Subunit: 349 residues, 4 copies
């Protein structure tokens, strides 16, 4: 013998069914799982102090947007928010349920430097993860998220073998623990845009990473039918003075995925990773003009769904409606991009 025991068919069915619901046509994920420190930065942008009350107000503003569920299949939550009530006393999860949005929960405990690397990062959080997953399921979560980070630096040989090995190991362990507890795992191996590297460099690294990730997922007996991928798009580095064309980004991104991602995976939900709201919509749209694809190409956007929303809000309560309006504009934009039907707003081997 020596292979993986059979997964529970009942569990597997649930996972696969929820994965497909999350990767529904014309829909994608709202990533609102900013940790206390990450949300601080977001609020700093608009001059708002990071109070529990303000966070509760803002997350309520997002999830109580009437009709949001037309374009948003799931919303990733930070632990605080999962157990939080809106200023009016409605549980955040109940707001989600009312729009038919599936709650998801971020479950990693952040980044820690790998000893004797040049500030390359391991993702922590496996300790107690299985128990946390059980509690989170009971609280209403049906999918999870775990963020690993890799840097490109040709001069420094980044990402190093150790980085890739660690990222893949952590993601596989996390994914398998999640599925054991009936949670669909979002696998997020984010290759940062930092640097002045070319898009073809990003393509090469993305391919190497994903090849490593999916081998590890297989090694750890992860059910691809009941999982999702949240990868970077393939782009120039953020220091490159010329943002690649949307066609170019679409071509290399799709290429990189098709070269590495087995098609049993139901959905690829891109992180926006610093892209403007409009680039993130156009790039996705351009990919889905190239369909049909073996898996759903959609979105799991944080900044690219909230940037204008935050700036419309400004911390002013009376700006709630206008803020919710702009969130809808962008949710609709990206839902349409999923179908390759977004008009726009305000082979290489």
């Amino acid at each position: 013998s020596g292979y993986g025991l059979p997964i529970s068919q009942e569990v597997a069915k649930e996972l696969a069914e929820n994965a497909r619901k999350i990767a529904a046509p014309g829909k994608g994920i709202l990533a609102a799982d900013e940790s206390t420190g990450t949300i601080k930065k977001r609020f700093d942008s608009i001059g708002v102090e990071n109070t529990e009350a303000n966070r509760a107000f803002y997350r309520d503003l997002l999830f109580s947007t009437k009709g949001l569920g037309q374009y948003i299949s799931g919303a990733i939550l930070f632990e605080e928010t999962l157990y939080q009530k809106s200023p009016s006393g409605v549980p955040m999860v109940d707001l989600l349920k009312a729009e038919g949005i599936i709650p998801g929960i971020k479950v990693d405990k952040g980044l820690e430097t790998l000893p004797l690397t040049d500030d390359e990062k391991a993702t922590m959080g496996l300790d107690g993860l299985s128990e946390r997953c059980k509690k989170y399921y009971e609280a209403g979560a049906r999918f999870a998220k775990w963020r690993a980070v890799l840097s490109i630096d040709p001069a420094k040989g980044k990402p190093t073998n150790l980085s890739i090995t660690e990222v893949a190991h952590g993601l596989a362990r996390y994914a398998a623990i999640c599925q054991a507890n009936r949670l669909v795992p979002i696998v997020e191996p984010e290759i940062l845009t930092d640097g002045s590297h070319d898009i073809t460099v990003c393509a090469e690294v993305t391919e190497r990473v994903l090849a490593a990730v999916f081998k590890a997922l297989n090694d750890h007996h992860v059910l691809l039918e009941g999982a999702l991928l949240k990868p970077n798009m393939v782009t120039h580095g953020s220091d490159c003075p010329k943002p690649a064309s949307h066609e170019e980004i679409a071509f290399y991104t799709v290429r990189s995925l098709k070269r590495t991602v087995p098609p049993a995976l139901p959905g690829v939900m891109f992180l926006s990773g610093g892209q403007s709201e409009e680039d993130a919509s156009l790039n996705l749209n351009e990919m889905n003009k190239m369909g049909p694809h073996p898996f759903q190409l959609s979105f799991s956007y944080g900044r690219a769904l909230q940037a204008s929303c935050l700036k419309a809000w400004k911390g002013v309560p009376e700006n709630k409606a206008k803020a919710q309006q702009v969130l809808m504009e962008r949710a609709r934009a990206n839902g349409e991009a999923q179908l390759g039907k977004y008009g726009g707003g305000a082979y290489v081997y």
Copy 2:
């Protein structure tokens, strides 16, 4: 740096174009590349002595079948045949060209036991391979084939890690050498049916092997767009008294491929591996009733295309026509199976 140099776009284009031609809808591969010893066994079945003249007569009988190219996109040849003339003096390759059938060449040098394994096999042939590929291209070949073999034996822990590692390493090296010489590599990791194991055991092993193979292909910078896979179907062991249903075989085979094979690969061309001619047609057909698929599911059949052909021939020259007729019946059967339109002849996680 440290990544693979860019492939020649001109070479890549050729490979990708020829791979897609081979995996054309409604068409598949005739595997007529039996070595001298393997063809002996085939001829023994029908009481024919293995002479060069008889081999030339038989291969001519196959390739000169009028209208064969309607269902056969490519034909795998043994070296002898590639440089051989029909009894009438027509080069074998010219017969192929006349039907628009792409010539392919088997390039491995057979099997050798891995030291200190229980008769597990390495595939030999890398030495001189690159030079052979150049000559073969010039002779008209545009794709190649390399057969690796794995056994299932739960009691003996077969296939062992060493077996899988060796198979994958050899296949990747061979594939990359082929593409460097403008030949599309057929990657054949055959898991033998030997034993009384269940279909679910075959599924598990097939998944492990293919995961290992495609990781290795990626490591060796193989262009999936310009390659083909020739895997076993997922079936019960040959000693199991109950042949699995065609639906069951179709389901687990497709599942195993979708769980491991990135969709940039243009085609999966199944070996028939001992299956009757009709099972091989029905099983393929059942898979393509489940389409559309991310890659072409087709055939690269040896025995399942020739079994009745040989028995109709019997070594009798005057039986040439009848023999060619039956080959057409089966070529048509499998071409139709490719499209899921074969009528028949005479979710589990």
Copy 3:
């Protein structure tokens, strides 16, 4: 680039110096790091309820044994004990320091089943490990311990690839984190004796595991000069009716280590793993009759140093002296075994 940054020479020096102190000739480790649940079992053997007071009494009994430091270079502590005072109010660490015994700290958070394995175990504890190490160093600890566990079961293919991969990954991460915080890591990949397998089976598995472990240590930039190995001895399974001869155990154990352990490692400190006190002494002694060795072969014994000590104590305070006497008898026995000079008490390829 892409390799590991240079370790701090000052840190490295400290680690290497302390590793050599721990693996001092004629000395070894007292493993007194039983968790709350493990010590319960030990106390159950002698009918003593697991109170904090009784644990403090017992650990004091051990560490306050006059002259213990002659044979004991280091003592592994559970967190509780590291921050604990004897019944008389003397800090446990001060008892150790008074005998010149180096304090060590167990830092793993125990075992958790790997999903979809047959109850194979991952070791948890990386989360927060680096911070814990800093605190532990400040409390006086200079080395750490992390226990991974593997099972042999030929019928079930245990240990599986996933088990070995996980064990090695966890050990390497833990080791590197430890060294970053100036703590010598004891690497403990314990292959359980459970089962009726032969000693030659144990030898094969031990070799495979250690090969995997030391490759991983190298991958993670662990300094072998500043680390220690705590492996199982190579023995028959615990269900085998015939305990192997001490010569046999010595031969295969040494063989397995020399086949896999690079000699920059200063010390191999065996776990006793269920062996009687006398077998553990005789087996070690027999190994060091075969010296000189490329590394120190010594002991890190829990049960094999305390078994008679506990039974002499019986929870009776007045039995303290007698209990301390027997601990000395065994500490001396194993110190002498380290030098191959123990008299006894009451080539295969």
Copy 4:
């Protein structure tokens, strides 16, 4: 199950016994296995045309040196020479036997670029290797040699993962095939000195390579007791204007070996790799001043044993005696260096 079958104890004994004979104290290997093209270069240095007669004359000059066997335990031969007779009609092997020098045979078929690498090399020769080994054993050979080559180029990320993986795979396959045929395999993963890299860079790469090599040897069931390592010394790059001190080279070389080479290996026989004759002697000597070591540190020198010999010969027959004299001077020099008793001639973590 799933592990390696037991090696033949009779075969293993022979291999281990011959490995120890080759790595005898005060002795080392004469590497006279230059291929036709490599010997051309050597002869070009002294203005001698590469005729079969001249090659036979020169190899006779080497092996017929009276008393050579005092310092030379084995001599590596090219196939031609193994089946060659001296100008006087004495078989080359009989000259060796007369001095009690063990014949060895180079068995690789040279280097071939790995596709899509920057001219990184695979070693070819596995095809037919097992059969060649049988013939070579019968001809008198008792050990074999296989040369793999790696380059250091930080800017190009050399050696790449593919290079290391290939080198290790080829060496392991070759080693296991050799032992199956009763031949001790010399494992030669030569890291070229090309470049201006530092000695610490060489140390890091050497460690990575050897870690990979010995993991692969273990995976392929190679008997370390019956094998030898032929590694580069750890030195500055050949373009560095400052040759490292002999102490420095000795320290880092020993360090790199002790960090990666399990001590069951009987001998490390260094290649001279472009070093002057005197540096090669002094560097080895300096290492053996640091003894005792867990394995024999000795030599397998080609150029560093023949450089002056060739220049003394000049192709002039009458210079045979003088040429043989200088070969003895150097054989004695390196034999003494093996024991750390060579006078000279004309901790960092």
